[PDB]
């Protein structure tokens, strides 16, 4: 039951950081995946050899499942904050959810347009990827239906916003640009990547706000955060190593397009992102 | 756990009715409550007598609580459909949820602008309103976390989409236009109502689609729909009567519009 309603007894808290983020989302999130022109992407894909064609799919496979996972797995967070009466957070989470729906749609339209919609891309999820996206992420979010303690909320935000989004998605955006933007390939996809990357900034800021407000109540939670980050790292780097090793074995795309794909710089960016995320949370 | 992902094994079902409605929501859902100019609404409200001021509040009280209730109480429906693998429904429900947030925002911005944000409008919720919005609606949706059976889904969609939205919300939009548009009062608010009414068409289409696809499996479910509609009518009309009595504008025309919406919603569901 509802005991009352905030906007009947009072108003929205207009100065709440999440209401301000919600207003930014409305202003900055108007893009529509249906408006992206993928016609040149289709031509680029068909111009590639079977061997070059496969070079690009592992990354798209990771994103496509990732967007879908987070579309579904953000609902428990919105439920738990709704039950705590955090209306401004809930308002913002509606934009977060609608962003992720558009992200799922974007990568699925690209797959459809380039002619791989019928291909099962699951073969590029190794065991580390599944640990995070098939298991740890849904376990941490679904927990919130029965356990919305600060410990549970920190853990959900950490897996979802600081690892999945703040570490893996950010490094994927960077990787796309280092490879495909340099090569001049897939302009529709990269347009979408740029929209995603802009949306993502708000998603990570929600996670920072959520973790920090819990850490502000009791310093002890800061060490929970750092520990949950470190618990997930081996799967992060285990997925990244797997992508890196696939890429090192399919060098035709880089040759054809004259790219020196520094896979060690990419791996260093993942490590940098991970430690950046850790540092955006303060003990006090 | 996730067994796999539809957009990795395959793609979105591009032809699915709820993917189509999602596409229409993105195209038609761009409005922003923050762009509405409420400055004249403030002047209009200040120029009313104390008695005319309090005449306006009950309806706004009903809407502001109602938008907040549906923003929160749609989440179990999104979860239950997500859990059933209905990805296109979920994509649509993200637009549904973001619409209701903008609706909460619009009425709260209006209360703030005209200077009643500090006032507690709960006094204008009678027992019948609380039965629907404080109790029956969250009960029926929250049930879906543990019981997503066809019977529970039809009950949730009936209470939410056919009664709260299809009967009360539609009637309230009609009421606002009949009273205030003929009076040249609250033009910001009425612009917001026009946007809300456009959004609400899709929300009702979702409810119809949901109830009808469950009825198509078994006609027994048609009779459950009609029964649950009738179960709620006494509270719908109890609330409408309470509002009508406060106003005492052709109030019997409004009252009959509510009955007209109620029967229209029944008719939009086919036994077969
Ligand atoms: C070759 C270097 C590897 C770089 C690492 C790339 C990681 C791929 C990204 C897949 C996960 C995407 C998750 C989306 C999350 C969201 O939208 O919130
Ligand atoms: C005086 C005649 C009475 C007319 C009926 C007025 C009913 C007021 C409406 C309040 C409930 C609004 C529910 C919001 C649901 C939504 O927008 O999805
Ligand atoms: Fe995200
Ligand atoms: Fe609605
Ligand atoms: Mn390993
Ligand atoms: Mn009564
Ligand atoms: Mn995303
Ligand atoms: Mn509404």
CA–CA dist A114, A52 (Å, integer): 14
Q: Which DSSP state fits A251?
A: -
How determined? X-ray
Please tell me the residue having the least CA distance from ligand 1 atom 17: A67
CA–CA dist B75, A96 (Å, integer): 14
**Phi and psi angles of residue A69, each rounded to the nearest 5 degrees, phi first:** -55, -50
- Comparing CA positions, the residue from B129, B127, B130, B136 lying closest to residue B158 is B136
- Comparing CA positions, the residue from A221, A259, A263 lying closest to residue A242 is A263
Residue with tokens 């992508």: A243
A 210-249 residues inside an 8 A Cβ radius of B: none
Give the DSSP letter string of chain B. Answer: -----HHHHS---TT-HHHHHHHHHHHH----GGG---HHHHHHHHTS-HHHHHHHHHHHHHHHHHHHHHHHHTHHHHHHHHHTT-HHHHHHHHHHHHHHHHHHHHHHHHHHHHT-TTS-GGGG--HHHHIIIIIIHHHHHHGGGT---HHHHHHHHIIIIIIIIIIIIHHHHHHHIIIIITTT--HHHHHHHHHHHHHHHHHHHHHHHHHHHHHTT-THHHHHHHHHHHHHHHHHHHHHHHHHHHH---HHHHHHHHHHHHHHHHHTS---
CA–CA dist A99, A31 (Å, integer): 9
CA–CA dist A276, A271 (Å, integer): 9
Yes or no, beta carbons of B30 and A30 under 8 Å apart: yes
Judged on CB neighbours under 10 Å (0-12, 13-18, 19+), B127 is exposed
CA count, 13 A, side-chain hemisphere, B116 = 24
Of A22, A64, A72, the CB nearest to B8: A64
CA–CA dist A240, A267 (Å, integer): 7
CA–CA dist A104, B12 (Å, integer): 9
Question: At CA B208, angle to CA B196 and CA A8, rounded to 5?
Answer: 35
Q: Which residues place a Cβ less than 5 A from the ion ligand 6? A: B 238
Domain at A271, CATH number: 1.10.620.20
- Comparing CA positions, the residue from A271, A239, A61, A73 lying closest to residue A157 is A73
* A78's tokens: 């919105």
Maximal CA-CA distance, chain B: 64
Ligand 2 environment, Cβ below 6 A: B 59, 62-63, 66-67, 70, 100, 103, 164-165, 168-169, 171-172, 175, 200, 203, 240, 243-244, 254, 258
Helix (H, G, I), strand (E, B) or coil at A176: helix
- Comparing CA positions, the residue from A136, A152, A161 lying closest to residue A79 is A152
Residue with tokens 């990570």: A204
Residue with tokens 């640990």: A131
* A166's tokens: 């703040």
Give me the sign of the Cα torsion angle B66, B68, B73, B74.
Answer: positive
Q: Which residues place a Cβ less than 5 A from the ion ligand 3? A: A 165, 203
Domain of residue A186, residue span: 1-284
Question: At CA B75, angle to CA B90 and CA B134, rounded to 5?
Answer: 145
* B205's tokens: 């289409």
Q: Which DSSP state fits A238?
A: H
CA count, 13 A, side-chain hemisphere, B51 = 3
Please list every residue in chain B whose beta carbon sits closer than 8 Å to the beta carbon of residue A10. Answer: 117-118, 120
Closest residue in chain A to residue B35, using alpha carbons only: A27
The total of structural domains in chain A comes to: 1
The answer to whether residues B8 and A61 touch, using CB atoms and an 8 Å cutoff, is yes
**Phi and psi angles of residue B5, each rounded to the nearest 5 degrees, phi first:** -130, 130
The answer to whether residues B159 and B231 touch, using CB atoms and an 8 Å cutoff, is no
CA–CA dist B124, A174 (Å, integer): 54
CA–CA dist B10, A110 (Å, integer): 12
CA–CA dist A14, A45 (Å, integer): 48
CA–CA dist A208, A281 (Å, integer): 7
* B26's tokens: 């993105």
CA–CA dist A281, A264 (Å, integer): 27
CA–CA dist B94, B204 (Å, integer): 15
- Comparing CA positions, the residue from B101, B25, B208 lying closest to residue A105 is B25
- Comparing CA positions, the residue from B80, B218, B251, B53 lying closest to residue B149 is B80
The answer to whether residues A36 and A106 touch, using CB atoms and an 8 Å cutoff, is yes
Task: Give the CA-trace dihedral at A237, A239, A240, A241, to 10 degrees.
Answer: 80
The answer to whether residues B232 and B132 touch, using CB atoms and an 8 Å cutoff, is yes
What is the Å distance from ligand 5's center to B103 Cα? 48
Of B9, B65, B91, the CB nearest to A8: B65
Please list every residue in chain B whose beta carbon sits closer than 8 Å to the beta carbon of residue A87. Answer: 68, 104
Breaks (C-N over 2.5 A) in chain A follow: none
The answer to whether residues B74 and B110 touch, using CB atoms and an 8 Å cutoff, is no
A23 interfaces chain B, CB cutoff of 8 Å: yes
Task: Give the CA-trace dihedral at B173, B175, B178, B179, to 10 degrees.
Answer: -120
Give me the sign of the Cα torsion angle B250, B256, B262, B268.
Answer: negative
CA distance A80 to chain B (A): 10
């Amino acid at each position: 039951h509802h005991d009352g309603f905030q906007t009947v007894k009072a108003t929205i808290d207009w100065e709440h950081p999440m209401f301000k983020l919600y207003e930014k989302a409305k202003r900055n999130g108007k893009w529509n995946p249906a408006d992206i022109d993928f016609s040149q992407d289709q031509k680029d894909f068909a111009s590639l050899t079977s061997e070059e064609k496969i070079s690009a799919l592992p990354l798209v496979a990771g994103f496509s499942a990732g967007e879908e996972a987070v579309t579904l797995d953000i609902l428990p967070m919105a439920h738990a904050l709704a039950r705590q009466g955090r209306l401004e957070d809930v308002l913002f989470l509606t934009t977060f959810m609608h962003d992720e729906a558009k992200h799922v749609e974007m990568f699925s339209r690209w797959q459809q347009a380039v002619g791989i919609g019928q291909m099962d891309l699951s073969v590029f999820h190794n065991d580390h990827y599944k640990r995070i996206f098939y298991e740890a992420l849904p376990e941490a979010m679904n927990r919130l239906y029965a356990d919305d303690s600060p410990e549970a909320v920190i853990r959900a935000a950490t897996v979802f916003n600081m690892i999945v989004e703040g570490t893996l998605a950010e490094s994927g955006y960077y990787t796309f640009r280092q490879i495909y933007k340099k090569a001049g390939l897939f302009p529709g996809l990269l347009q979408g990547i740029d929209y995603l990357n802009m949306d993502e900034g708000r998603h990570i800021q929600f996670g920072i706000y959520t973790i920090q407000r819990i850490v502000n109540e009791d310093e002890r939670y800061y060490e929970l955060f750092i520990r949950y980050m470190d618990e997930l790292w081996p799967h992060v780097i285990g997925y990244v190593d797997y992508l890196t090793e696939l890429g090192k074995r399919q060098q035709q795309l880089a040759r054809t397009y004259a790219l020196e794909i520094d896979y060690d710089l990419l791996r260093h960016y993942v490590i940098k992102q991970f430690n950046l995320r850790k540092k955006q949370i303060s003990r006090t």
